[PDB]
Amino acid sequence: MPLVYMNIIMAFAIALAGLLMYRSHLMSSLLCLEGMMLSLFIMSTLIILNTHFTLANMMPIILLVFAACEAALGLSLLVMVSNTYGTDYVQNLNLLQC
């Protein structure tokens, strides 16, 4: 199988590691979550365009319009923890210890 797909497949994995590992900022995590659906978009388009699955061209447009809905929700939650805590650092988000 073509190396361009493995290039995409790691692209998910390195994006996956960045989302899970966290460093300081939820902005970066939201950025990492977007690389998730991004690499999914090229991977979806690549397979679908290669196989001439005409109706399946549906999914790429449908994929990110719903992935962008995560941004609509994810970005909003960040500003609220930014409004209350200050910086949106994940370390601040620890009130629910119990």
Q: Within 31-70, which residues bind other proteins (CB under 8 A)?
A: 31-47, 49-70
CB 42, min distance to other proteins, A: 5
C-alpha to C-alpha distances, 77 to 36, 71, 88, 91, nearest whole angstrom: 19, 10, 10, 15
What tokens does 50 get? 């290669």
Tell me the closest approach of the beta carbon of residue 93 to other proteins, in angstroms: 6
What CA–CA distance (Å, rounded) separates 10 from 52?
Answer: 25
Specify which residues 40 forms β-bridges with. none
For other proteins, how many residues bind (rule: CB under 8 A)? 88
Residue 91 found at the interface with other proteins (CB under 8 A): no
For residue 3, state whether it binds other proteins (rule: CB under 8 A): yes
